[model samples]
Target: MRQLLLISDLDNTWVGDQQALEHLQEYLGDRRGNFYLAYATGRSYHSARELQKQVGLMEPDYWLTAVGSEIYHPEGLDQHWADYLSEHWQRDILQAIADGFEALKPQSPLEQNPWKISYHLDPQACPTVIDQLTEMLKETGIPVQVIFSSGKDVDLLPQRSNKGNATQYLQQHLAMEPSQTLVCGDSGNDIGLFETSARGVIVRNAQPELLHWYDQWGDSRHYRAQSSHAGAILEAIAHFDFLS
Candidate 1:
């Protein structure tokens, strides 16, 4: 069976200190051709392309973009891999969030209008509003799962769209099995993959809530490899017998 590794989350986790991309190049070496390179990120396709060039990732095999709202594959720029969202879902969710935003205009200190698809209340809104906003979103009938990655932003994805689902998609597409896959990530959004994979590794720099959640959800075999950046990634891959 072909073992797969998913290198997820680009900003801090993969592009940290501007050294990670280069480090990945070094560690990945000749094996880049062997693994299915996919980025499970919060970026849109256009935004991800900028990072891809910056990181020097030669056209990856798959891209999980828009926080898994869309998937793109390499067939040149004109071709689209697939869009996983339904039209009704997008319209209703956006309209509902827009109404909420307007209703809370006095409380909304957001500098920019939230992105239409994954909009959220301003960072200045009370922390309690996170739950309130999530609850409001739930009532939209969009079946989204809300996860906060930082103090200000909430990731809105389909209830079924998680890193684990992305990994599963890759596994099926590549004709690999669940037990042969590995995933590593550092935040609440990545918890899905960490829980479902045969082996999951969480770097030490992960958010505290995420760490607690991971511990609660994981078994002893799910290792917390305590290191950060590409060096940490290399260590974890070696530990998993991915490299010699």
Candidate 2:
């Protein structure tokens, strides 16, 4: 059984630095048999899968997509996780509320998910706009998490649906120790994964939105890597002394 767990975001965290990725690939190929790998991303399954196949990413043992609104094993969708999020979710109502807001322009079709509503916020959308939008969603009697990150990216999901919750689910179901878990990411949306007891690796190229979070919640368990992308992943894996 694997004794270590790695959960990482895909975009800027896992996709950058192809050469570094090849090095990681070689490292994994030869060593570290007691390790489990997972990817958590705001990208939908389709988009995440394409990147996995096309990019330098190794096939992950588990997948948390669309901001953890959906979970998948290597074999198939985790219908149980979907059912859990489905309980308090009203996608149609959420969309209707969003339609009322001029700032909530829909993201591309492939980026959308039943439990997730993705958007590109208007340039002028300040914090007040999100507060207003959140109130609107709340009045619908739907529990939601309205996430605005990297200035313009917006995502709304079920209250309990997030990277941290999904990764926690995996950790529990897989029977992993808290000490065995490591989370790596590079954006504001990634903060959910860091909220857990797991150790965190924040790459140097992390967005300002996430850096602001670090300002509020930085801790000894969190590592702000000097490197970026795959380099940062390797840095953290080594820093944590898991690369034997």
The true-versus-predicted C-alpha distance at residue 44 of model 1, in Å, is 1.3
Give the CA lDDT, 0 to 100, for residue 35 in model 2.
Answer: 85
Over 94-182, each residue of candidate 1 has an lDDT whose tens digit, in order, gives: 44574566324321232121222444446566767767777887887676676665554566656666666766766777786555566
Estimate the Cα RMSD of every predicted model relative to the unseen true structure.
4.2, 1.5
C-alpha displacement of 162 in model 1, angstroms? 2.9
Candidate 1's TM-score: 0.80
What value does the lDDT take at residue 133 in candidate 1?
Answer: 70
Tell me the deviation in Å of residue 68 in model 2. 1.0
Q: Which stretches of candidate 1 lie over 4 Å from their true place?
A: 76-84, 87-90, 98-116, 120-124
- Residue 227 in model 1: lDDT: 70
Native-referenced Cα lDDT, model 1: 0.61
* lDDT (CA) per prediction: 0.61, 0.85
In model 1, what lDDT does residue 127 have?
A: 61
